[PDB]
Structure 1
Amino acid sequence: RQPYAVSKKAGHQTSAESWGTGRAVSRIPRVAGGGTHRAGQAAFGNMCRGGRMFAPTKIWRRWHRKIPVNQKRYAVASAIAASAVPSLVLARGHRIESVPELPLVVSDSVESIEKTSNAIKALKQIGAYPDAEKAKDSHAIRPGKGKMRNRRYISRKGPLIVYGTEGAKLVKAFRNIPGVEICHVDRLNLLKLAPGGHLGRFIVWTKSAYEKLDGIYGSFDKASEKKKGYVLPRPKMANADLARIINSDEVQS
């Protein structure tokens, strides 16, 4: 975010003074002088026309937040795990009925694509094109005052492409396609993995990035090479299949 605040001097650029009691009027301070429509009018009040607002906004409001790194990594891992559940990806609004399987891992040759047409052809080949088409078709003007605040167009989110090679040319080839987002495997962002705080982003992995995932996030047993001392969190439940436990031989006996 960028800070916003009203002018600190707004509503106070006057020498207005209260008339006191005894003149059958309110005690609010009033503009001095005469010969103009402004003379005698109230001032300085949050209830006065042309006055100062109550508790004027200030730039030193606490705009930012300092979340522990471990919690950030927990959230990123949770979003990555949710991206592998087809039900969650469907529940987040992505059209994945034609994708061969999840997680969607494609050959590294895609990283060398230079033209947007070739990128579209690759998307069609891997079965992810319908999601991009849905994103393009949702292009519309943002309702409300936001359309005059330099945020004029909104649309749905398409697939997120994750590549493992720095400087790959697919970033240029894919960036003009509406809804499509690209990110390097070593700097994954929760804001793109869970748009709007909702789990199940549709993700297309290059082979190299998928291979690097193990070295980046480690595992339960051993530690990560890229995150010093980090270990993936463990759930409170080893097996979340409640029916298997409730209807087991031990419990039912």
Structure 2
Amino acid sequence: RQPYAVSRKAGHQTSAESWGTGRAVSRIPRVGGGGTHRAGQGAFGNMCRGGRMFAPTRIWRKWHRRVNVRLRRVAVASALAATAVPAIVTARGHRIESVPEFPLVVSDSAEGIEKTAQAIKVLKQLGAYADAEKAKDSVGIRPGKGKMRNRRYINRKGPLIVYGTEGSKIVKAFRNLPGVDVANVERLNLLDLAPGGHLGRFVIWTESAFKKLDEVYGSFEASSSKKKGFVLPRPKMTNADLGRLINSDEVQ
């Protein structure tokens, strides 16, 4: 965020002083002198046309909040773990009905392309060009006071291509696609991996990235990871299939 707040000196650039009791009018500070309509008009109030607002906002609100670094890591791991599910990627809204397999992976020869014609050619082989098309045809002008504050156009979200090999060129090829994002795998970003707070951004991995996920995140082992002080969260149930629980021999 950027801090917003009304100017400190608002409403107080008038030297008004109340009329006090005995003038058949309210006791609120009133503007002195004469010759204008301004004389006699209340000031300094929140209630008055031309005064402050109640508790004027100040720049020292809490614009940024902190979250435990391990809790960011937990959240991003559970953002990844939800994408590997076709059902939640679908429920999150993406059009995945011709995509061949989840979690989807392409060869590393994808890394070498340059143009967005090539990028669309690539997404044809995968099943995600339907999703890019959704993103591109959904584009519209943002309703409300947003359409005048430098946020004219909104859209939907498309496939987030994740690479691993730094310095390559698809980062500049997938850029012009609306909705379609590109993220390196070292620094996966939660704003990408789960927009809106909802689970399951439809992610398209290249082989180079996918084969170094485990070298980044590690396992249920101390110091497995590239990230110090973190082991993958373990759930509160190993297998949450209430079917087999409530229907297995032991329980029944």
Query: TM-score, length-normalised on structure 2?
Result: 0.99
Give the C-alpha shift of residue 221 in structure 1: 3.2
Give the C-alpha shift of residue 168 in structure 1: 1.0
Distance 2:66 2:224 in 1: 23
Deviations 1:22-41 (A, max 9, x none): 11000000000001110111
Distance 1:225 1:209 in 2: 15
Q: Which amino acid aligns with 1:69?
A: V
Matches within 5 A, 1:200-239: 200-239=200-239
Matches within 5 A, 1:10-25: 10-25=10-25
Give the C-alpha shift of residue 222 in structure 1: 4.7
Name 1:198's counterpart in structure 2. Answer: 198
Deviations 1:191-249 (A, max 9, x none): 11000000011000000100110011101135333101311010011110011011111
Name 1:250's counterpart in structure 2. Answer: 250
CA contact (8 A) 2:106 2:205 kept: yes
- Secondary structure (helix, strand or coil) at the match of 1:109 reads helix
Gaps (5+ residues) in structure 2? none
CA contact (8 A) 2:219 2:225 kept: no
Name 2:68's counterpart in structure 1. Answer: 68
Q: Which amino acid aligns with 2:71?
A: Q
Name 2:157's counterpart in structure 1. Answer: 157
Distance 1:58 1:73 in 2: 32
User: How many correspondences in the alignment?
Assistant: 252
The percent of aligned pairs where both chains have the same amino acid is 79
Distance 1:224 1:174 in 2: 33
CA contact (8 A) 2:134 2:156 kept: yes
What value does the CA root-mean-square deviation take over the aligned residues? 0.8
Query: TM-score, length-normalised on structure 1?
Result: 0.98
Matches within 5 A, 1:168-183: 168-183=168-183
2:59 matches 1:85: no
Q: Which amino acid aligns with 1:81?
A: A
Name 2:39's counterpart in structure 1. Answer: 39
